[PDB]
């Protein structure tokens, strides 16, 4: 079994490098963020441009959806996160507290909380309703590259240029685990598996690893792509075959068989680094996005 992703749409409109693309949990929408300070919303199935959401004073590195698909949070170089009402485009809350660029953000499954990671080396936990910062974790000793809640939100995984991946107890802020590796290249990306048992970690030595969280053990390695420079998103594709999906600094989307670790597909089309990829929640649809020689988002669909 191999996928057969084919190009469906190319979405143009951002005026600088695109930073992050995410499908709404209800599958209806794609949100994108960019160095151009804008969020844009697009129909997931027809690629139709819906609206632009603006307000950040500097470039945006990440965006994330609430569980009901009604809210977005964005993380910006302006040191803030913003919570947006997607239907109105209005900024509901500006989340202030970070002392440097906000790099990464996610809601928890209940979506009463938001977690953020910053160049200021901290992880913050925010109350969605009030916009107040509930906890500041002294998480790392370099910029925080990624933050992600597990399946029920009880845990937070973070990664950093300090070479570490740490797991945090959401309720107490306490560190449950630091992943044990003999070496410490920058960790550029981390995410829980959908069942919360595994962690997918990227390092800037062209390497993705699947870690068993309970055992503290590396189970799988995925290679062949280029990743030495940028914090590139990776994914679990679960709708058809069980794949790992990543962007690449050679302008390609890479798809691996999760279990065998074989490259099953490489998607060509982009004309710059593929910084971000996202997997649709119910269909075999990938969204990919690229840096400033390109500035487009591509939507791809497979039979499996």
């Amino acid at each position: 079994v191999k996928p057969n992703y084919a190009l469906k749409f190319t979405l143009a409109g951002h005026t600088k490098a695109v930073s992050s693309v995410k499908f709404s949990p209800n599958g209806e929408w794609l949100a994108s963020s960019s160095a151009d300070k804008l969020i844009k919303i697009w129909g997931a199935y027809d690629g139709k441009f819906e609206k632009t959401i603006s307000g950040h004073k500097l470039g945006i590195s990440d965006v994330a959806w609430s569980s009901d698909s009604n809210l977005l949070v964005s993380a910006s170089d302006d040191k803030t996160l913003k919570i947006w009402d997607v239907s109105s485009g209005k900024c509901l809350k500006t989340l202030k507290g970070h002392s440097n660029y906000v790099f990464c953000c996610n809601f928890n499954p209940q979506s009463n909380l938001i977690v953020s990671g910053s160049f200021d080396e901290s992880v913050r936990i925010w109350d969605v309703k009030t916009g107040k910062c509930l906890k500041t974790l002294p998480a790392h000793s370099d910029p925080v590259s990624a933050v992600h809640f597990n399946r029920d939100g009880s845990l937070i995984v973070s990664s950093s240029y300090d070479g570490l991946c740490r797991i945090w107890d959401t309720a107490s802020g306490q560190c449950l685990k630091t992943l044990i590796d003999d070496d410490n290249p920058p960790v550029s990306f981390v995410k829980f598996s959908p069942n919360g048992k595994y962690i997918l970690a990227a390092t800037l030595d062209n390497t993705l690893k699947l870690w068993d969280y309970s055992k503290g053990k590396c189970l799988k390695t995925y290679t062949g792509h280029k990743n030495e420079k940028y914090c590139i998103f990776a994914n679990f594709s679960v709708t058809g075959g069980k794949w790992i999906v990543s962007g690449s600094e050679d302008n390609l989307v890479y798809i691996w068989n999760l279990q065998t670790k074989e490259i099953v597909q490489k998607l060509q089309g982009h004309t710059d680094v593929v910084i971000s990829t996202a997997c649709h929640p119910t269909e075999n649809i990938i969204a990919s996005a690229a840096l400033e020689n390109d500035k487009t988002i591509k939507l791809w669909k497979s039979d499996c």
């Binding site: 600088k16 490098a17 695109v18 930073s19 992050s20 960019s34 160095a35 500097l58 470039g59 945006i60 590195s61 990440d62 170089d77 660029y101 790099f103 160049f119 910029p143 240029y161 420079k229 940028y230 914090c231 910084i275 840096l291 400033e292």
Partner: peptide, 6 residues
Amino acid sequence: ARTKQT
């Protein structure tokens, strides 16, 4: 931003 290498 994430679009510049750091």
